[PDB]
Amino acid sequence: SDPTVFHKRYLKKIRDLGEGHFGKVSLYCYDPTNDGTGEMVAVKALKEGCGPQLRSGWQREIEILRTLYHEHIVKYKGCCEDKSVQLVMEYVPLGSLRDYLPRHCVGLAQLLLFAQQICEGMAYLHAQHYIHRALAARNVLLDNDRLVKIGDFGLAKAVPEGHEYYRVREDGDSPVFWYAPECLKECKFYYASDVWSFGVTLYELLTYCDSNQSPHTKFTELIGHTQGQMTVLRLTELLERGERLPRPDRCPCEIYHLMKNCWETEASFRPTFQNLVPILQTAQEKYQ
Ligand SMILES: O=C(Nc1n[nH]c2ccc(-c3ccc(NS(=O)(=O)c4cccc(Cl)c4)cc3)cc12)c1ccco1
């Protein structure tokens, strides 16, 4: 049989795994032969209420993941056709860094190794000419042997042929607290804009995804209670002014400087994912 065809009749829902604004990801057992064991798979589906523009983007998302092959990117397994389409990916037993970090003992060197694998997947993603737009700890997953896998591509976009950015409009609903000022102000999401999001993800790693130190709580503390384009505006006001997330508790200064370098106001002055890989390898070596 075609390894990419999953018939609904052999899919059995275990539990939910994650929920975004547009999609839902659940764990299923695939057992065509009713053998008791079966194969565990993650199935992502578009929520009811997504209009034709979201439905088209959903087709492009499935196609982007079909295309990506990297050790630090969640593997595409196939599709489940109804009348709607569900995206079948591999099951990664350790979950997201947002759910793994608050309850596990993770030393600085292992945190830096996690950050490195993110960069490796991210450098491959940028080489294939794609931007991610949602690089947050919650979208980074751990497989067997704590092997990192970027797990969600819902906002990923193809960067046109010879361009350094994709023009993407209005949304105070998107991960705005992980966003560089240039895509908040100019609606231009550069390759360097994803590097800014890495800096925030590294901050999340160093705060062990502590909800009290979270970008939401820290930026809500400054901006207050805001929604939509009001959040986008108030944040832009803070960022190009020079305001950045604080140095997390127990974070060595040189790591915070790495965060700050990913947070340069001028997009062209931020390191590339290609440059970040050896920097983190050395940082990883420095501590144990
Ligand atoms: O989670 C597991 N196992 C997985 N195996 N395979 C997977 C593929 C993707 C996800 C996944 C990806 C992203 C998010 N973030 S989000 O909730 O904010 C979100 C954002 C945007 C869209 C959607 Cl839909 C969800 C959550 C889960 C998880 C697994 C797991 C947990 C414990 C052990 O194992």
Author numbering: 883 to 964, 968 to 1173
Q: What did the original publication write about this model?
A:
Janus kinases (Jaks) have broad roles in immune regulation via their action in cytokine signalling. These non-receptor tyrosine kinases phosphorylate receptor chains, which in turn recruit and phosphorylate members of the Signal Transducer and Activator of Transcription (STAT) family. Tyk2 functions together with Jak2 in the signaling of IL-12 and IL-23 via its interaction with the IL-12Rβ1 receptor chain, and in the coordinated phosphorylation of STAT3 & STAT4. Here we present the first mouse Tyk2 crystal structures, which are complexed to 3-aminoindazole compounds.
The placement of this moiety is guided by the sulfonamide linkage’s stabilizing interactions with the NH backbone of Glu898 in the glycine-rich loop, and conserved residues Asn1021 and Arg1020. The binding mode and trajectory of the chlorophenyl is identical to that of Compound 1 and, as a result, the glycine-rich loop adopts the same conformation in both structures. The furan occupies the extended hinge region, sandwiched between Arg894 and Gly977. In the mouse Tyk2 structures, complexed to either Compound 1 or Compound 2, the steric bulk of the sulfonamide chlorophenyl moiety occupies substantial hydrophobic space under the glycine-rich loop and would potentially disrupt the His/Asp “glycine-rich loop lock,” thereby creating a larger active site pocket. Compound 2 (30 μM) significantly increased resistance to partial proteolysis by thermolysin. We obtained crystals with a kinase-inactive form of the mouse Tyk2 catalytic domain, only in the presence of an ATP-competitive 3-aminoindazole inhibitor. This crystal form provided a robust inhibitor soaking platform that enabled structure-based drug design of Jak inhibitors.
